[PDB]
Amino acid sequence: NYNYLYRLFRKSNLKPFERDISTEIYQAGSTPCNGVKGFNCYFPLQSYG
């Protein structure tokens, strides 16, 4: 099933007792994503096998 998704990547840590649901691409390198993965960009949210 793929109903459970979790985040791998974020700019920083998370404060206690709060939630973030920002479904946005992540800049994994110096190359800006500009809304496109391309290279050095991956989606933080992914499912579980």
> Cβ(9)–Cβ(42) under 8 Å?
yes
Q: Assess 31 for contact with a second copy (CB under 8 A).
A: yes
Find the shortest distance in angstroms from Cβ 13 to a second copy: 14
5, 2, 9: which is closest to 24 by C-alpha?
A: 9
Question: In terms of CB distance, is 5 or 8 closer to a second copy?
Answer: 8
Given 19, 30, 34, 49, the residue binding a second copy (CB under 8 A): 30
Q: Name the one residue in this structure whose structure tokens are 């109903």.
A: 3
Span near a second copy by CB under 8 A; candidates 11-19, 24-32, 41-49: 24-32
Residues 30, 41: Cα–Cα separation, whole Å:
9
